[PDB]
Structures are given as C-alpha cells and as structure tokens.
C-alpha cells in the first residue's frame, strides 16, 4: 500500500514506489568521527530565527509537522556549506519506542532518542515546489534529542499534542521560537543527502549539530502518544517513524569543528 514504517510499508518497502530509495546520495548516514575530518574551509553557520512565524501544527500519520509561513527573509539558515539563503518552512522530529533508539543519523554507531529536522528551501528557487526538485534546493539542521532536563522551548508544542492525537488533525500554532530548541554550540557535521521520507529526493545538505539538546521523559512520552493512525481506527502508537542508517556510498561527511 502507501508508504509508513510497519513491517508492510517501511523503510524496506520504500524502494517499491520510490526507486531512489537505493539511490547513492540516500540520509540518513552513520557519521563515523574518526572518517569524518575537519575541514578549515567551512564558513560559519548563521542560523537567523528572530522573525519566524508559526502559523499550524499538524499530524500528518508519519510524524507532526509545525509550519511557518515562508513568503518572507523571515527565518533563514546561511553560511556554513550553503551558498545563498534558505527559508525555514517546517520542522519535525524523529523518535523511537525506547530511549535506545529514534534519531536517523547516529555518530558512531550511537542512535539517540530523537532527532528534529528543520527543513528550509533555497531562495534562488521562488518557492518550496521548484526547490525540492533541485540538488541544491533544500537545507536540513538536524539536532539529536538526550533524555535529560526539560527543554523549555519544547513545551509550547508538547502542550497542543493532544489536540492532534490522529492521523489528519491540526491546530493554529503560532508565535511559536525555534530558537527554543537548539542547543548551545553550533558545531556540525555536513554531507549531500536525501529527504528521509518517500519521494526521498536527493536534494538536501545536510547540517547536523554535534551537540545534542537534552528534553525530559515526560516530553518524550508525550511524543510517544501520539497515532499513526485516523480518528476511529485501531490504536498504532506513532513510535519508531525513523528510517535507519544508508549507505554512504561516495560521499565525505565534513566537520565543521576540530
Ligand atoms: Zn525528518
């Protein structure tokens, strides 16, 4: 059928529909520390959220998606590897059933509880539509999520999750700061890459921050609430919408730190 994460329609059915699937720029990756070098030539990250504007959250049956409106310079993510500007147009999270596992990109070999994608589109494309068709198109901050202390910048959205328990339920969501949820450094890692869920269109540089945010237990389980499914159909947590590690194939990870 139409693609999720059971044992029918998983990461290892994707391939069925979307072909590029086994595709040689497929995310996520391991990011092996000791492979992944340094490299002096990467400018620095510049990571401006002050404008964002939140307008809905949303359960689309894989995960939640909090969008912003992306008509403006609003919020951008420059520098680092990119070349030009890219507009913050929705985030999301990764997690799993267990705090053993969740995040997509793991650091050698360790999975964390979560991962955060703040997916932004390239200005020179005019809108989200052209962009995501381009290899250039798209930038994604991957940030891990420990299990820890509370992030407070978290709370805003654990608190409208119940008014999207099911598959097709939404909520006007705004004046919400995504500056809230990154962590101190901005150190990161950086590889060209894909889209993790189907069309898994390799259009995406990848920027993932090295230093983990710490949420608490309640915050996770409160993601862990959540249904893949419809309103009236039987229970299917949403726990476990990560696709695993992909082959690295030709690629170089790059670290922006030493
Ligand atoms: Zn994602």
């Known amino acids: 059928h139409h693609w999720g994460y059971g044992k029918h329609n998983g990461p290892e059915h994707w391939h069925k529909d979307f072909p590029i699937a086994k595709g040689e720029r497929q995310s996520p990756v391991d990011i092996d520390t000791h492979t992944a070098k340094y490299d002096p030539s990467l400018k620095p990250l510049s990571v401006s959220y002050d404008q964002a504007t939140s307008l809905r959250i949303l359960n689309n049956g894989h995960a939640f998606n909090v969008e912003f409106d992306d008509s403006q310079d609003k919020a951008v993510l420059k520098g680092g590897p990119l070349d030009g500007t890219y507009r913050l147009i929705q985030f999301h999270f990764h997690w799993g059933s267990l705090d053993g596992q969740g995040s997509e990109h793991t650091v050698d070999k360790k999975k964390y509880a979560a991962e955060l994608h703040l997916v932004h589109w ?22 891990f999520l420990k299990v820890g202390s509370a992030k407070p910048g978290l709370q805003k959205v654990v ?18 700061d995504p500056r809230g949820l990154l962590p101190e450094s901005l150190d990161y890692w950086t590889y060209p890459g894909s889209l993790t869920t189907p069309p ?26 959540l249904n893949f499914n419809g309103e009236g159909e039987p229970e299917e947590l949403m726990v476990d919408n990560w696709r695993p590690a992909q082959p690295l194939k030709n690629r170089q990870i790059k670290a922006s730190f030493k």
């Open 122 to 143: 390239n200005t020179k494309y005019g809108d989200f539509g052209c962009a995501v068709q381009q290899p250039d198109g798209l930038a994604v901050l991957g940030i």
């Open 159 to 176: 608190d409208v999750l119940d008014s999207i328990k099911t598959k097709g339920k939404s909520a006007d969501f705004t004046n919400f």
């Open 200 to 225: 898994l269109l390799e259009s995406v540089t990848w920027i993932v921050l090295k230093e983990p945010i710490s949420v608490s237990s309640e915050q996770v389980l409160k993601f862990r609430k």
